[PDB]
DNA sequence: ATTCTGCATGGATTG
DNA sequence: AATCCATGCAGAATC
């Protein structure tokens, strides 16, 4: 059970837009890699084990990328976050799960 | 009249 | 001193 990122969740990613940024650093050393910038479906799964899936992407910006998981409104819903709160990846070893975590804010 | 969408921009932040 | 990333934004769909 590898965790590997954090992310407190900005405005933009607690609200209903339906997109949260993953840090380049982060998504580029811990998501898989993805040549095109449509992307891969990335299915994760929370605490009690609800598969969400979610469209990790990327688009140009400057000529470098921004990475970016869309369809995240319902599970983020579904663990009562706000912003402020943080949001946690982890792994599994044998094959690759990738695991959504999450805590709320003092 | 309201949500997708595919990016830009510039204060932060990092190197 | 360079490149993030939180959010603005303008057009296309959609209510």
Same mark, same amino acid.
């Given at each position: 059970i590898v965790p590997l990122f954090e992310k407190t969740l *900005?405005? *933009?990613?607690?609200?209903?837009?339906?997109? @949260?940024? @993953?840090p380049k650093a982060c998504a580029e050393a811990y %998501? /898989? /890699?993805? *040549? =095109?910038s449509e992307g891969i479906? @990335?299915?994760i799964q929370d605490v009690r084990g609800r598969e969400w899936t979610f =469209? %990790?992407?990327?688009?140009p910006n400057n000529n470098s990328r921004m990475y970016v998981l869309e369809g995240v409104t319902p599970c983020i819903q579904s663990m009562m976050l =706000?912003?402020?709160?943080?949001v946690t990846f982890s792994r599994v070893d044998p094959?690759?799960?990738l695991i959504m975590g999450s805590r709320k804010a003092a």
């Open positions: *900005s405005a *933009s990613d607690a609200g209903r837009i339906g997109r @949260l940024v @993953l %998501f /898989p /890699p993805i *040549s =095109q479906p @990335l299915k =469209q %990790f992407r990327y688009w =706000q912003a402020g709160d943080t094959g690759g799960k």
